[PDB]
Amino acid sequence: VQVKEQSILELGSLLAKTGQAAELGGLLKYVRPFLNSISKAKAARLVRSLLDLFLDMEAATGQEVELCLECIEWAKSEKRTFLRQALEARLVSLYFDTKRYQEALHLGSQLLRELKKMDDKALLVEVQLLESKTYHALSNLPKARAALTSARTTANAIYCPPKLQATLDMQSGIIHAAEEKDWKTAYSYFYEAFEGYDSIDSPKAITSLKYMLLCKIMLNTPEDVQALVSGKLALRYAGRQTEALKCVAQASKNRSLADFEKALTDYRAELRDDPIISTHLAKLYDNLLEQNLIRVIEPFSRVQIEHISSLIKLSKADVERKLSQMILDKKFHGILDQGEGVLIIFDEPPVDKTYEAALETIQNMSKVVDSLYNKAKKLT
Amino acid sequence: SAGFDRHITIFSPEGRLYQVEYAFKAINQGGLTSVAVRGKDCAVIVTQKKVPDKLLDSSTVTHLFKITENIGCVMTGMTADSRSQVQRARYEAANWKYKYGYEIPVDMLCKRIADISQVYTQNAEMRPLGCCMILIGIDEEQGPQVYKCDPAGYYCGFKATAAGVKQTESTSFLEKKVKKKFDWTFEQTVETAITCLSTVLSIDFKPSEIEVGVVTVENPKFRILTEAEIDAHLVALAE
Amino acid sequence: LRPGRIDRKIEFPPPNEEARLDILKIHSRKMNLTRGINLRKIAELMPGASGAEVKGVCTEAGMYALRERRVHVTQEDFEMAVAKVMQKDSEKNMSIK
Amino acid sequence: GYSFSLTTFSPSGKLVQIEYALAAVAGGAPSVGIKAANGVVLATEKKQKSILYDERSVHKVEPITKHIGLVYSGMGPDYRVLVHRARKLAQQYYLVYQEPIPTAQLVQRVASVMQEYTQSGGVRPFGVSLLICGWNEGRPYLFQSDPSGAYFAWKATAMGKNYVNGKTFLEKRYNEDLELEDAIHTAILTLKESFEGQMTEDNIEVGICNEAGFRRLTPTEVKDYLAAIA
Amino acid sequence: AHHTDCTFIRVSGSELVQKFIGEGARMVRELFVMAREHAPSIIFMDE
Amino acid sequence: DVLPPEADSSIMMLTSDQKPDVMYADIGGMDIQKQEVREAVELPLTHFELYKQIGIDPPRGVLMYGPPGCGKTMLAKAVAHHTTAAFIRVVGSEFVQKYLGEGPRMVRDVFRLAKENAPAIIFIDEIDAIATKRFDAQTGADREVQRILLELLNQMDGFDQNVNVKVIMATNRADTLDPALLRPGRLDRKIEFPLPDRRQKRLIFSTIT
Amino acid sequence: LKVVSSSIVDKYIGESARLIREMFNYARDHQPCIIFMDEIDAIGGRRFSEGTSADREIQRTLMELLNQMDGFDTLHRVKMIMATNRPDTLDPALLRP
Amino acid sequence: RYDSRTTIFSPEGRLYQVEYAMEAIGHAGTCLGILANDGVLLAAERRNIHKLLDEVFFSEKIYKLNEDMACSVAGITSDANVLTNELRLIAQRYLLQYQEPIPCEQLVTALCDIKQAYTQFGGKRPFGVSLLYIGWDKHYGFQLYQSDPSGNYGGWKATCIGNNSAAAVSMLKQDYKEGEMTLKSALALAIKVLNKTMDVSKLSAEKVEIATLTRENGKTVIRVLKQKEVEQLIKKHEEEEAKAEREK
Numbered sequence A: 001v002q003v004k005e006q007s008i009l010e011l012g013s014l015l016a017k018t019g020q021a022a023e024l025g026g027l028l029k030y031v032r033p034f035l036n037s038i039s040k041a042k043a044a045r046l047v048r049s050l051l052d053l054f055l056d057m058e059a060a061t062g063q064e065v066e067l068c069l070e071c072i073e074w075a076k077s078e079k080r081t082f083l084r085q086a087l088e089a090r091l092v093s094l095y096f097d098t099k100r101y102q103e104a105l106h107l108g109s110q111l112l113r114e115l116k117k118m119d120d121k122a123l124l125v126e127v128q129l130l131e132s133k134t135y136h137a138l139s140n141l142p143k144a145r146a147a148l149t150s151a152r153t154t155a156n157a158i159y160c161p162p163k164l165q166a167t168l169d170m171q172s173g174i175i176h177a178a179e180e181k182d183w184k185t186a187y188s189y190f191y192e193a194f195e196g197y198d199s200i201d202s203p204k205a206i207t208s209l210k211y212m213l214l215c216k217i218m219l220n221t222p223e224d225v226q227a228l229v230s231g232k233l234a235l236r237y238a239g240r241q242t243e244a245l246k247c248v249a250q251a252s253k254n255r256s257l258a259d260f261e262k263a264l265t266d267y268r269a270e271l272r273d274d275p276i277i278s279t280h281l282a283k284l285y286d287n288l289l290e291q292n293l294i295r296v297i298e299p300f301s302r303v304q305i306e307h308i309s310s311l312i313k314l315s316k317a318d319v320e321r322k323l324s325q326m327i328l329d330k331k332f333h334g335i336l337d338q339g340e341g342v343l344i345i346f347d348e349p350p351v352d353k354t355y356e357a358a359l360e361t362i363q364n365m366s367k368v369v370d371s372l373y374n375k376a377k378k379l380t
Numbered sequence B: 001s002a003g004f005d006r007h008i009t010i011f012s013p014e015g016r017l018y019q020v021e022y023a024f025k026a027i028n029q030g031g032l033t034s035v036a037v038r039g040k041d042c043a044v045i046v047t048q049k050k051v052p053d054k055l056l057d058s059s060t061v062t063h064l065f066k067i068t069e070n071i072g073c074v075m076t077g078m079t080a081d082s083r084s085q086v087q088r089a090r091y092e093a094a095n096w097k098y099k100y101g102y103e104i105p106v107d108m109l110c111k112r113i114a115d116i117s118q119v120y121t122q123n124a125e126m127r128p129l130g131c132c133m134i135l136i137g138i139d140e141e142q143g144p145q146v147y148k149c150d151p152a153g154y155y156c157g158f159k160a161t162a163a164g165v166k167q168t169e170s171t172s173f174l175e176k177k178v179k180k181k182f183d184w185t186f187e188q189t190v191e192t193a194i195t196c197l198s199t200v201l202s203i204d205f206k207p208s209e210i211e212v213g214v215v216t217v218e219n220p221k222f223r224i225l226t227e228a229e230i231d232a233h234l235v236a237l238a239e
Numbered sequence C: 001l002r003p004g005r006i007d008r009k010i011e012f013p014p015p016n017e018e019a020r021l022d023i024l025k026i027h028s029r030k031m032n033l034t035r036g037i038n039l040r041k042i043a044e045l046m047p048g049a050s051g052a053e054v055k056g057v058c059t060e061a062g063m064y065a066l067r068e069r070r071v072h073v074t075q076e077d078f079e080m081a082v083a084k085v086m087q088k089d090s091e092k093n094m095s096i097k
Numbered sequence D: 001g002y003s004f005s006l007t008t009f010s011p012s013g014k015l016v017q018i019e020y021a022l023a024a025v026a027g028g029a030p031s032v033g034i035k036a037a038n039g040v041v042l043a044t045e046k047k048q049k050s051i052l053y054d055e056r057s058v059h060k061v062e063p064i065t066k067h068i069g070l071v072y073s074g075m076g077p078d079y080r081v082l083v084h085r086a087r088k089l090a091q092q093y094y095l096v097y098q099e100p101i102p103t104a105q106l107v108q109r110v111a112s113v114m115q116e117y118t119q120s121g122g123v124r125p126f127g128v129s130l131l132i133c134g135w136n137e138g139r140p141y142l143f144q145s146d147p148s149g150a151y152f153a154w155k156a157t158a159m160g161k162n163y164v165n166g167k168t169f170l171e172k173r174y175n176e177d178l179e180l181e182d183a184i185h186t187a188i189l190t191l192k193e194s195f196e197g198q199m200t201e202d203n204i205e206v207g208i209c210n211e212a213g214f215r216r217l218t219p220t221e222v223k224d225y226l227a228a229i230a
Numbered sequence E: 001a002h003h004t005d006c007t008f009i010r011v012s013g014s015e016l017v018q019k020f021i022g023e024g025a026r027m028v029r030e031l032f033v034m035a036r037e038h039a040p041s042i043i044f045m046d047e
Numbered sequence F: 001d002v003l004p005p006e007a008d009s010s011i012m013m014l015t016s017d018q019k020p021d022v023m024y025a026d027i028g029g030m031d032i033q034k035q036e037v038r039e040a041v042e043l044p045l046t047h048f049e050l051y052k053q054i055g056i057d058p059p060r061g062v063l064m065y066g067p068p069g070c071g072k073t074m075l076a077k078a079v080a081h082h083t084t085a086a087f088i089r090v091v092g093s094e095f096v097q098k099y100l101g102e103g104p105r106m107v108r109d110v111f112r113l114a115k116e117n118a119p120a121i122i123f124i125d126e127i128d129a130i131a132t133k134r135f136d137a138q139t140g141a142d143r144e145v146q147r148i149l150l151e152l153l154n155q156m157d158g159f160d161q162n163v164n165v166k167v168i169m170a171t172n173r174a175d176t177l178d179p180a181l182l183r184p185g186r187l188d189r190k191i192e193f194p195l196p197d198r199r200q201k202r203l204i205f206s207t208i209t
Numbered sequence G: 001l002k003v004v005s006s007s008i009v010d011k012y013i014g015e016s017a018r019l020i021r022e023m024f025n026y027a028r029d030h031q032p033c034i035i036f037m038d039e040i041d042a043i044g045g046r047r048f049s050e051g052t053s054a055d056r057e058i059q060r061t062l063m064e065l066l067n068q069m070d071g072f073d074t075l076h077r078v079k080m081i082m083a084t085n086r087p088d089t090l091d092p093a094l095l096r097p
Numbered sequence H: 001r002y003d004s005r006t007t008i009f010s011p012e013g014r015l016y017q018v019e020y021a022m023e024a025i026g027h028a029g030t031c032l033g034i035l036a037n038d039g040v041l042l043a044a045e046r047r048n049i050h051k052l053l054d055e056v057f058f059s060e061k062i063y064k065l066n067e068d069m070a071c072s073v074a075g076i077t078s079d080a081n082v083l084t085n086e087l088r089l090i091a092q093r094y095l096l097q098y099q100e101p102i103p104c105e106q107l108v109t110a111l112c113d114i115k116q117a118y119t120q121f122g123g124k125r126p127f128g129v130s131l132l133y134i135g136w137d138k139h140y141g142f143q144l145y146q147s148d149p150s151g152n153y154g155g156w157k158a159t160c161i162g163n164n165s166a167a168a169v170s171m172l173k174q175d176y177k178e179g180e181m182t183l184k185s186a187l188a189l190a191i192k193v194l195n196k197t198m199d200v201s202k203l204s205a206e207k208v209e210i211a212t213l214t215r216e217n218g219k220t221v222i223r224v225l226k227q228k229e230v231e232q233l234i235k236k237h238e239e240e241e242a243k244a245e246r247e248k
């Protein structure tokens, strides 16, 4: 029995790599009777390894959700609370990979009700973190902050394994980074997450490393990005991903949109994960507004071509629309200043007489309406 | 705190013993400093001897006292108190031969001397004794051993130790010297001890002022170095 | 304290469970309590409250909603506030006697 | 007038001098004791004030009997006096009953010694707190004797500076079905939380009381546990 | 004080008068004399 | 004719023209304490409407207690620098004269200044306002200090509700920490300042460097 | 400028810090001139430590001095050296670099 | 003023140090006893419960002193350990001299004379311990007793000493019935009194310690009820409260 368990682990590892996903799924169905024969407490950890082995094999989400549900039914038949709670937590993480619109939220909500009643706090903190990640995916930031805050408060009382503390710290960084009110605190959480991830979770550390570098570019201190990669702590994970952040920081220091664009074009893989850099390009088009002011000042100097579109930084004629988006709302405060040769950018719309009279005349005529009532009633 | 246990050996808010802490200060009231240095095969005690008036015998005024043939001590503190401790240490060392059939280990003399001091702190009707004792002896299977005891009853083994007014600075010089990896031979240990007093006091003392007592693996007996021998080391370190 | 100078010596007791509910209702008058809130349970959850503490539970609970940017107060918010207003002090090895 | 004597009652509550003694125990090097399923593990922070002090001289964890060991938080001179008396009472029991003293009984006898000092007079109470351990009766036993003379049993406990932080750490990580080796790791970790510096084989002294006896771990052994995490 | 129909005087203040450099009998003798001027009067003391 | 109003809190309102000059950004790493103190003190003045909408009556007094050097006063001065209110920090002892129960003189000035501009905020530190030469209980001595606690408690009660005179206290003293001062309605919010740990230290080190 | 403090403490304990600020402004007038806090403890009679009749007003002035020295009143490279062995107690916070 | 020495007597003939010690007993776990026809019982509140503390020691506030006697201690912990040993010593010393178990009143009078002596002699402080005695003797049958730090003692059908003693005494005086205690009824009275005196809600088994002394087959059989026995009594009290609901 014990010898079979180690043999099954050896067979499962082979099925995870050399073996087909269907063969690994067949082994899980085969070991369901074996799970009954072995002690339930040992069986639950064995199930975690088997599910992880299925994840190691080529992803088959239709089979993976079905196998997880079958395992949930076996746990329901055995009525083992620990296995069912853990199975739901793996399934919500599997749902997060498919980014289920509400299915990830639904399973988590059901598990939360059981877990708040249950004394297994460590499972509760993990599920709370999953809810914050899914709310961030759906763009509901306030609920995501609430799930993160609840996870932290439960975690503070209980002992935290290193992976849990690091995952909790990175999520604090993602929510703090998303708010955009403070990026300095977000960097501190990401570094704490990378420091925890070092050695214990090698794949996770690079993701925190990329985020802490992004924070430096976002904090308007691009020079530090190169220094952090140079540091011995970051040297182990240094790679193409580190280079992409370095070039983007250089582009922001150069204050050149073309340099930022070239970096975006060079590393497609790095571009997919983070869209905050796209917001930096929008600040950079606003950074070139001063050059547009000199281009708008070009009529005051020498107007050439358009002075609002073809002339600005030469480049594409699709530059127009960035100006149009600026013209709506606050901006240069000049409507289509392309024709003139002298430049007419100014706004003077607050004359007190128009506003004060318009308010008083409406208020004064209210006396006229009221006076009519007072006089008419006495008259008749 | 102050104004609480100032007049008695009783506990104070924050659990501080004022009368015993004042005793450590009285050792400094002596106005003299002592340094002791352990070595690969040697233990050296050095003290400053001040002859206040020419009409006083240099031989009579000694703060280096042999307790047993293989054990010697340097006493820093009030003179009367230091001598009383010396008689007790000699009696206990003698009893150890008398009741156990072997010579007192240096570690054991300290525990006995410290235990007498601790009882004075716990039970009233006794002044703690304003003196600190550093004991040097060679122990087979332990090498040369330097040990120190406090009025409170604290005892500890020290690679190098100091006591008196300049103890804090003296330990600081010793800390730099001890940090150096090289072990110290008899010449080096005599030199380190004399230099430690020299750097701390800046006296550049003549042979008469420094009193040096040394115990060695080759000669286990505690030996009080003669003035001529003391001068020979003092000239050599200057070079 | 002599009766001629002071005729009556009225005593104000710590609010009873019924009284705590009454004070809770008085201070929850303007709050937008969501349907399903149990004010009676909240009075039971805090025993021997100082009345001002019952007022405190409402103010802290409202702030939990304000930080969450919602005007809809919920049963959980009152329960969390009860804990925040409540204060507990203990020491160890001084448990002689 | 109260708080200056242990021979007089407080005019309401309790004698303050015993409480002041507890304050001295609180100002002590951290001591962590972890009872475990197969043994009791005791530990203390031994940091010399200067590099000169020898770490091989006076020892904080000291054996009292083959199966009984003691650790202390509080004034160091007072500990040696009770370490001797506790050892002697264990010997008197052996001569009278030809059996090693049971751990529970030794704690009661040691506590009576501590109470005598708290009695009226010039004598001042011991400023040390103790963590007796034993394997008597096939069951691991961990006990604490305070200066007052009260004795209590702890699954895990801490005394000295940051006792509260240690106790809260113990609440979070101490289970019950843990082997002594796992208990050794937890004991070292609690000291690390309150350790103002990098723990080294010399810095921490750890003593175990398994079903074989109380043996202070060798400096090399402490280093191996300090290494490889913990 | 809101539902009174009587003068309400609040004297929760401490001693700044009497024999200090301040004034004489202000806390008590003066407070009662003012209460005499308004016959229906209630005085609230908070110490 | 009537002259314009004369006199001002301390030297002048908001600690005169002497703004502390420590920005909230300069105080880096006290994130939880910064948010709580802001809600208790700065937010009621800036957005009273939000508090009225939930009808919660804004929390007023805040108690900040921590091991020394943990960043409570740098935050307290920072609140004065970032405040739009007449935040005369009014540490307990400064322009105050010899007096018995001098808690009224300080609070009375705050009410007038809060009315003149915006609800004023008081920080309790330099709490040696009393212990004056014209002071001493008849025989108890301690009673006179107790009299100060009572006088402060009477003023704190409920102060100008909407123009609340917010009171921030950072005294690590149990003697003035009576349950009555800790009662809700007096020190409504309590924030404890932890010794900078890892991450909080990294923030303090990065900002200073 | 000698800060004996006898002139600085006249009829108001609080005014002592304000008068020191006036002296600091006088010190600012000459960049070479250096403030010397000689005999800082020295005062009429004896320095008043915390006490029922008189508290440690001088200690409060020392804390006020620390605030004046850094930030609000530092210009002209004038050094307010506390070169005095007169004070019985030295503040640990003052000792900080 | 007239404090400090137990020896000084106040101008009103009052020994304040003895009075202070008697007041001090209040800061201690509740201990109560009921005489109970056909039995006797001692109930105590187990204060200072914590997850880490083992509670390996059998009992904690209940100590047997003889084959036919027992006591519950409320007071300074160290003083209690001193008194319990002396009470055990006096019991065996009487057996050695007369070969009969000590009559219960005598064991109480002897400790009380020792406690009384501490008050009359200058050097020592008055004992801070008060205790309740349960036992059976042939001369006067089942008895219950109380001792004070002053050294005064009394026999009570029911009494309480620690914590809210007055609340228990008021509840006991109304609920107790003379001659009708019937042990099981007395156990119920204790659980109900304990619920009122303890601020603890639900009176969990760990918080309560119950020791019952009965004479079975001519031999006293002092027994401390196990947690399971205590739990059933607690559930019965809770069920009785449920029966009281609506009717009340």
Ligand SMILES: Nc1ncnc2c1ncn2[C@@H]1O[C@H](COP(=O)(O)OP(=O)(O)OP(=O)(O)O)[C@@H](O)[C@H]1O
Pocket (backbone or CB within 6 Å): F026, F027, F028, F029, F030, F066, F067, F068, F069, F070, F071, F072, F073, F074, F075, F170, F203, F204, F207, F208
């Ligand atoms: N968040 C922070 N960022 C940067 N420096 C800080 C921060 N918090 C504290 N410091 C530094 O620590 C110093 C000590 O702060 P502060 O004196 O306000 O501490 P405190 O605990 O409030 O003590 P006190 O109440 O005595 O003023 C500050 O003056 C500043 O130099």
